[PDB]
């Protein structure tokens, strides 16, 4: 996270850390949507151009963390993956369209003050909150600049108009993506950065006071560049795939 601030304890209890077994290293963020399911960005797992393809055996999920590097005894819980599912139509060849993956925990995790699932938006929640100018929140242990925090970082960013998104880049943007970030004129900065991939973009419903995961940290051209914006997976649009995979 660039230009963020240290999170408060328990501020983002669905925050997950994807952690490589060997070498030991933070792979990406993720999110806890049930006691057995973790949501993240497919590119955290599979990115052929860079020779990346992680399997179940390669990783661990660390839940309930605050500190980036300490083993938080008695606080954090570490789980093994049973199965990874990548969207059948994730487009790694061109624009990371459909950048989404589900991970099934080997055993259900027990909830605590530090471990709690975020909600998945409904059509009307999406309708209502996913509007230009409205602010969401991103969290993660990623680089502080395009610079490794000691604790979880947070920043709040406004969703940006589609046309402004489209006109900031040469990449073909799809309906499965949304961008977020301040404008150069705006007098405020912030962005996700490397190590933040796969984390949650959340919003708090003014109707039911619940936190919903609207986005997944997806791609961006660098980190915190003027006139550029962070791109996020549009969770609601892929909600049917999610369901489908948890039902089946």
């Amino acid at each position: 996270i660039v230009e963020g601030s240290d999170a408060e304890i328990g501020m983002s209890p669905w925050q997950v850390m994807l952690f490589r077994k060997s070498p030991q290293e933070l792979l990406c963020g993720a999110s806890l949507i049930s006691d057995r399911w973790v949501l993240t960005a497919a590119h955290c797992l599979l990115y052929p151009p860079w020779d990346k393809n992680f399997t179940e055996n390669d990783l661990l999920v660390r839940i309930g963390k605050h500190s980036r590097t300490r083993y938080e005894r008695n606080i954090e819980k570490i789980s093994m993956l049973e199965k990874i599912y990548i969207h059948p139509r994730y487009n790694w060849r061109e624009n990371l369209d459909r950048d989404i993956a589900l991970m099934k925990l080997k055993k259900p995790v027990a909830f605590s003050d530090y471990i709690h699932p975020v909600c998945l938006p409904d059509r009307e929640t999406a309708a209502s909150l996913l509007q230009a100018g409205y602010k969401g929140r991103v969290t993660g242990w990623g680089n502080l600049k395009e610079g490794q925090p000691s604790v979880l970082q947070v920043v709040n960013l406004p969703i940006v108009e589609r046309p402004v998104c489209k006109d900031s880049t040469r990449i073909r943007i799809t309906d499965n993506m949304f961008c977020a970030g301040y404008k150069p004129d705006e007098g405020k900065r912030g962005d996700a950065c490397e190590g933040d991939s796969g984390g949650p973009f959340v919003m708090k419903s003014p109707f039911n006071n619940r936190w919903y995961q609207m986005g997944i940290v997806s791609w961006g051209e660098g980190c915190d560049r003027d006139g550029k914006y962070g791109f996020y997976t549009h969770v609601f649009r892929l909600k049917k795939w999610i369901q489908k995979v948890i039902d089946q």
Partner: peptide, 26 residues
Amino acid sequence: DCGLRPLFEKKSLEDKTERELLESYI
């Protein structure tokens, strides 16, 4: 139960910046 944090919503405490989100919504 989703999306209600044990240390905040469940105790009626607010985090230090969630007001900033709410104020942008309308």
